[PDB]
Amino acid sequence: AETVSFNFNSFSEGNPAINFQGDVTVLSNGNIQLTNLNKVNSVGRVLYAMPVRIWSSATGNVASFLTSFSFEMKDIKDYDPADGIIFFIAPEDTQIPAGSIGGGTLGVSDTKGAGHFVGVEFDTYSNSEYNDPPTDHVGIDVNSVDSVKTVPWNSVSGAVVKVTVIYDSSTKTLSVAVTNDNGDITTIAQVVDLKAKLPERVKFGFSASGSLGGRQIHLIRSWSFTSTLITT
Amino acid sequence: AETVSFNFNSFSEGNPAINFQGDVTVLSNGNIQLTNLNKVNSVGRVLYAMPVRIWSSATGNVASFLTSFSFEMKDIKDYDPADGIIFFIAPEDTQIPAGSIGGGTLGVSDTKGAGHFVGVEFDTYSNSEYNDPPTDHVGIDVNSVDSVKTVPWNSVSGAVVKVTVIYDSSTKTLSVAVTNDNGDITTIAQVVDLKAKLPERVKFGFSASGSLGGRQIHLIRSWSFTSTLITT
Amino acid sequence: AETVSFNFNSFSEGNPAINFQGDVTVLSNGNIQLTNLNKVNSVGRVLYAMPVRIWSSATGNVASFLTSFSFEMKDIKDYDPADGIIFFIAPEDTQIPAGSIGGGTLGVSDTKGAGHFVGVEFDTYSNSEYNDPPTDHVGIDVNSVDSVKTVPWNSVSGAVVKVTVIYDSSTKTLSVAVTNDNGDITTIAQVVDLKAKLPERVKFGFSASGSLGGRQIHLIRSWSFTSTLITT
Amino acid sequence: AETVSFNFNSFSEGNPAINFQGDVTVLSNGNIQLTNLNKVNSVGRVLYAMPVRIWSSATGNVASFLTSFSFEMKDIKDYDPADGIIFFIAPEDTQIPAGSIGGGTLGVSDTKGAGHFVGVEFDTYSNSEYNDPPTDHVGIDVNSVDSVKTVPWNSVSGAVVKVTVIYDSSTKTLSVAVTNDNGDITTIAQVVDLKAKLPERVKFGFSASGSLGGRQIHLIRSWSFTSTLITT
Ligand SMILES: CO[C@H]1O[C@H](Cn2cc(CNC(=O)CCC(=O)N[C@@H]3O[C@H](CO)[C@H](O)[C@H](O)[C@H]3O)nn2)[C@@H](O)[C@H](O)[C@H]1O
Ligand SMILES: CO[C@H]1O[C@H](Cn2cc(CNC(=O)CCC(=O)N[C@@H]3O[C@H](CO)[C@H](O)[C@H](O)[C@H]3O)nn2)[C@@H](O)[C@H](O)[C@H]1O
Ligand SMILES: CO[C@H]1O[C@H](Cn2cc(CNC(=O)CCC(=O)N[C@@H]3O[C@H](CO)[C@H](O)[C@H](O)[C@H]3O)nn2)[C@@H](O)[C@H](O)[C@H]1O
Ligand SMILES: CO[C@H]1O[C@H](Cn2cc(CNC(=O)CCC(=O)N[C@@H]3O[C@H](CO)[C@H](O)[C@H](O)[C@H]3O)nn2)[C@@H](O)[C@H](O)[C@H]1O
Ligand SMILES: [Ca+2]
Ligand SMILES: [Ca+2]
Ligand SMILES: [Ca+2]
Ligand SMILES: [Ca+2]
Ligand SMILES: [Mn+2]
Ligand SMILES: [Mn+2]
Ligand SMILES: [Mn+2]
Ligand SMILES: [Mn+2]
Numbered sequence: 001a002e003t004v005s006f007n008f009n010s011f012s013e014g015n016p017a018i019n020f021q022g023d024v025t026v027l028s029n030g031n032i033q034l035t036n037l038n039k040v041n042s043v044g045r046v047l048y049a050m051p052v053r054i055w056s057s058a059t060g061n062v063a064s065f066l067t068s069f070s071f072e073m074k075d076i077k078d079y080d081p082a083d084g085i086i087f088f089i090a091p092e093d094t095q096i097p098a099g100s101i102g103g104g105t106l107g108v109s110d111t112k113g114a115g116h117f118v119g120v121e122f123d124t125y126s127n128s129e130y131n132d133p134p135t136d137h138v139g140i141d142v143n144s145v146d147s148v149k150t151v152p153w154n155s156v157s158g159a160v161v162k163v164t165v166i167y168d169s170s171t172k173t174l175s176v177a178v179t180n181d182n183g184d185i186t187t188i189a190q191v192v193d194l195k196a197k198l199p200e201r202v203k204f205g206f207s208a209s210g211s212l213g214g215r216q217i218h219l220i221r222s223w224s225f226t227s228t229l230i231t232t
Numbered sequence: 233a234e235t236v237s238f239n240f241n242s243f244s245e246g247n248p249a250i251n252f253q254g255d256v257t258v259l260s261n262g263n264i265q266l267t268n269l270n271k272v273n274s275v276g277r278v279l280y281a282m283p284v285r286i287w288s289s290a291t292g293n294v295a296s297f298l299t300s301f302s303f304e305m306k307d308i309k310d311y312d313p314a315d316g317i318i319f320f321i322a323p324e325d326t327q328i329p330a331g332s333i334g335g336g337t338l339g340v341s342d343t344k345g346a347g348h349f350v351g352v353e354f355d356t357y358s359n360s361e362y363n364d365p366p367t368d369h370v371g372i373d374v375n376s377v378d379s380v381k382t383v384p385w386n387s388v389s390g391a392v393v394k395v396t397v398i399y400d401s402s403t404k405t406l407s408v409a410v411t412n413d414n415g416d417i418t419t420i421a422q423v424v425d426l427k428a429k430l431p432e433r434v435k436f437g438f439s440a441s442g443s444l445g446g447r448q449i450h451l452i453r454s455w456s457f458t459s460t461l462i463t464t
Numbered sequence: 465a466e467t468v469s470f471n472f473n474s475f476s477e478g479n480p481a482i483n484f485q486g487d488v489t490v491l492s493n494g495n496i497q498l499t500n501l502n503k504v505n506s507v508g509r510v511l512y513a514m515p516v517r518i519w520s521s522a523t524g525n526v527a528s529f530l531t532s533f534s535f536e537m538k539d540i541k542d543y544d545p546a547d548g549i550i551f552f553i554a555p556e557d558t559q560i561p562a563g564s565i566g567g568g569t570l571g572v573s574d575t576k577g578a579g580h581f582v583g584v585e586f587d588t589y590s591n592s593e594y595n596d597p598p599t600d601h602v603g604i605d606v607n608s609v610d611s612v613k614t615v616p617w618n619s620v621s622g623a624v625v626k627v628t629v630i631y632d633s634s635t636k637t638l639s640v641a642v643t644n645d646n647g648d649i650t651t652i653a654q655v656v657d658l659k660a661k662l663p664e665r666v667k668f669g670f671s672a673s674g675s676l677g678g679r680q681i682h683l684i685r686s687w688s689f690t691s692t693l694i695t696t
Numbered sequence: 697a698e699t700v701s702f703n704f705n706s707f708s709e710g711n712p713a714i715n716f717q718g719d720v721t722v723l724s725n726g727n728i729q730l731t732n733l734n735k736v737n738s739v740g741r742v743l744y745a746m747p748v749r750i751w752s753s754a755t756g757n758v759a760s761f762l763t764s765f766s767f768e769m770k771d772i773k774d775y776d777p778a779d780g781i782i783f784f785i786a787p788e789d790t791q792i793p794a795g796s797i798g799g800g801t802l803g804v805s806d807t808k809g810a811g812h813f814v815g816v817e818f819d820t821y822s823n824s825e826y827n828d829p830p831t832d833h834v835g836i837d838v839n840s841v842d843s844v845k846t847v848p849w850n851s852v853s854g855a856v857v858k859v860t861v862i863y864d865s866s867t868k869t870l871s872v873a874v875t876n877d878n879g880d881i882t883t884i885a886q887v888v889d890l891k892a893k894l895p896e897r898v899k900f901g902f903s904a905s906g907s908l909g910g911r912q913i914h915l916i917r918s919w920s921f922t923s924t925l926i927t928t
Contacts, residue, residue: 028729029727030772158705170419189398189407233473467880632871647699653864654867692880
């Protein structure tokens with residue numbers, strides 16, 4: 001079996017293992033800050049630099065994966081706490097969309113909300129143009145920020161949030177468990193055919209965005225990942 | 233929302249949070265040993281002492297949960313390494329079945345392999361009477377040790393195994409990720425309607441068993457759990 | 465180490481984690497209402513359902529704990545605002561005293577004011593028979609509602625009160641901080657040997673009572689708790 | 697009664713409510729970073745800018761207080777995780793000791809470990825020169841980093857730690873409860889006469905330090921405080 005495994009307890013500016021895109025910075029405490037608080041339509045993304053083989057064209061086999069990460073979103077004086085973080089999977093050549101308006105696109109899609117990715121968004125602003133639910137929510141996205149499915153959630157300013165994600169290749173099920181500050185767990189699951197929506201090799205990472213009036217602190221604190229593809 | 237959350241880094245005799253059933257002992261290192269290596273058809277089970285409300289007849293709501301645990305199975309001289317461990321959910325009055333033959337029943341079912349439980353088995357012996365697959369496997373069980381679904385797995389003697397389980401109430405999906413010593417992940421997922429198969433109040437725990445010729449060390453090293461039931 | 469931890473932001477009927485005794489009800493907003501406004505000598509108590517091992521006869525070790533809760537007492541028309549709430553610790557078999565007169569007993573003691581418990585009382589009526597100070601007070605109680613120590617306090621009708629309690633096992637000190645509506649803090653501390661006054665396994669909870677002409681709304685709004693006992 | 701109350705969910709370097717001393721910086725996420733990772737013998741301290749009257753020479757009354765704060769200590773590559781954070785109380789003219797060697801002094805004492813302060817240290821290095829216990833520990837300090845009392849503790853890299861402190865003026869008891877990431881609570885309490893050891897007016901704050909080969913990230917995330925002094 002072919003396995004990709006890594007663990008980040010902290011991050012650093014001169015680490016070849018991470019690809020930094022856009023407005024992302026690494027703070028002295030080791031956290032990744034995805035957006036720039038002084039820029040209009042700010043977009044920042046981080047990717048694990050090595051492409052992951054999620055499916056084999058020779059065997060037709062699809063990888064399963066287990067990943068856990070922690071983040072924090074914090075309000076900043078005078079701006080609307082927006083727009084949120086998305087944990088995404090995309091083709092290995094993925095870049096911030098050209099002429100990105102940031103905001104509700106979460107840095108992964110065009111103005112119409114379309115892109116080439118699979119993701120789990122932690123959305124803190126209700127965009128009517130992308131049929132967002134009225135409150136903060138966790139969503140399962142397939143090539144669109146108009147989520148396939150959402151669940152109500154609450155983004156608590158300054159709270160450390162823990163997420164665990166399981167992709168079971170046989171049932172094609174993406175399962176997500178989000179552990180909040182008040183101790184409650186929020187879950188969401190959806191069948192997503194990764195072999196049909198994504199290429200053979202992909203990149204995994206995080207993206208966040210803001211607008212002129214919607215800005216907040218978006219931090220990635222830690223990330224562990226294991227994927228296993230059967231080679232028989 | 234109603235949340236039940238606990239974490240065991242170690243275990244102790246006299247800990248009122250754990251109900252011990254059958255041949256269970258607590259080792260000096262804090263590990264739980266489920267079976268007795270010198271007894272024929274040995275059965276040992278540990279339960280979280282408090283009943284957990286997994287669903288409500290008033291709202292029709294069903295809880296989601298996130299649980300992680302670690303175990304170890306180790307071979308002993310001359311006996312067949314058998315029979316394995318099951319992580320199970322059962323009615324609050326659950327007891328080792330009367331006249332239990334241990335063995336392939338894993339301490340949760342009768343001789344015909346029927347019982348009242350939902351579980352995830354780490355099965356190290358192929359019982360033809362229970363239509364077991366030919367190799368070691370992880371299975372999802374619904375009122376029977378004749379699993380609804382299985383996935384091939386390998387039980388490595390002396391290896392610490394990590395398991396993460398997500399139950400998403402909306403899709404009724406039970407997703408399991410098993411992390412082995414060699415770093416590879418094994419996953420299995422199945423739609424199980426806990427509201428249809430179990431009572432409103434249940435107990436969560438572990439069970440293991442052996443036979444005359446089939447015995448091995450079955451250890452529970454740690455267990456964390458969080459369940460959340462929306463109250464409306 | 466052996467740790468018991470929980471957090472209630474709200475409460476619900478049928479939550480197997482809480483034992484309801486006497487006249488307790490759960491309101492639609494999630495608050496616990498301890499007494500029944502239409503009953504003479506009303507007594508209601510809520511206990512965390514799982515016993516807590518506060519000390520071990522094997523090692524001689526005693527647990528430390530940290531707990532925070534919020535309550536509200538509100539006046540009702542025609543009756544005297546009485547008698548108050550007590551946060552208490554008692555043997556695991558604890559029940560409302562048989563033939564309880566409620567009133568100044570706070571539902572934890574007999575007519576003479578004696579019982580088997582350790583508690584922190586928020587007393588709103590001056591019972592001369594229990595040597596109460598002349599005004600509202602917070603008291604530390606050891607097997608009696610004739611407090612070992614009191615501090616003057618003011619119970620404001622309809623005000624949400626926040627309490628934090630620390631029990632340091634090494635010094636045997638029970639420290640209490642009460643945050644009033646006017647913003648001021650009230651504190652009280654007393655050395656109490658829980659190993660000498662209580663059994664190894666105990667229950668934690670709240671109790672309130674009224675009399676014929678002494679009745680008021682007694683609400684428990686939230687409760688968080690953590691206890692840790694060092695093990696061999 | 698005379699009450700001082702404040703709450704910081706975040707901090708800003710351009711706010712007059714806080715005094716910054718030495719190598720302290722405010723990160724974009726709003727956290728306070730006390731030490732500079734690239735400097736030898738780095739010392740940084742933060743103080744609430746308004747002096748708080750803890751006792752009266754006219755009445756002889758002493759204030760009680762309740763304070764809660766959260767911090768994080770994180771390891772950095774190639775340097776020892778040292779030296780720790782101290783929550784301290786000191787005269788209103790308090791400054792980093794002249795020619796401070798940082799390290800085991802925690803930025804509050806001289807080379808011999810003596811200073812004018814009362815504090816609660818979260819010490820991560822065993823300095824034999826200050827009779828430190830062999831492991832990580834929480835200590836209660838009275839004019840010396842040779843603690844009056846200590847309790848074993850474990851500093852987990854990247855973990856958010858919650859602390860609650862109660863000072864009861866009647867018993868002169870300083871009680872501390874520390875909530876760890878593994879769920880366990882650690883407590884320590886000591887009788888400290890603030891009238892005898894400190895002036896009528898004091899400043900409250902935090903300090904941290906490093907050495908040549910002993911450096912780590914020291915962060916202050918939040919701080920709430922309430923003190924009340926009886927004026928009758
Ligand atoms: C209508 O213009 C008129 O006034 C303009 C003055 N103006 C207004 C604004 C602020 N409004 C806006 O930015 C509008 C766009 C908007 O609401 N985005 C959303 O902002 C969110 C946070 O609130 C989230 O981030 C969402 O994701 C994101 O979609 N900035 N400047 C003039 O310049 C213009 O000449 C004139 O004609
Ligand atoms: C066959 O009888 C004849 O010889 C007997 C002598 N014998 C044989 C045995 C051992 N066989 C057995 O125990 C048979 C049952 C068996 O295979 N269980 C499975 O053992 C596994 C480990 O290999 C797993 O644990 C499975 O889950 C479990 O089902 N023990 N004693 C006489 O006593 C009897 O008078 C006589 O007529
Ligand atoms: C004068 O007597 C004759 O007429 C009486 C008629 N009466 C009077 C009352 C009300 N007084 C009482 O209830 C007296 C007891 C009392 O003062 N409790 C305290 O009430 C507090 C609230 O004010 C707090 O709750 C304290 O904790 C609680 O101890 N109810 N009925 C008869 O009852 C009696 O048989 C008969 O001989
Ligand atoms: C033998 O000496 C000769 O070579 C030295 C060269 N040297 C050695 C070192 C490293 N040792 C040291 O730094 C020694 C001091 C020390 O152990 N502090 C503690 O370090 C901790 C982290 O491990 C914590 O921070 C504690 O709080 C802090 O007290 N750095 N430089 C010269 O400098 C010296 O002139 C010369 O004669
Ligand atoms: Ca949105
Ligand atoms: Ca089997
Ligand atoms: Ca009274
Ligand atoms: Ca030290
Ligand atoms: Mn959305
Ligand atoms: Mn099986
Ligand atoms: Mn009283
Ligand atoms: Mn020390």
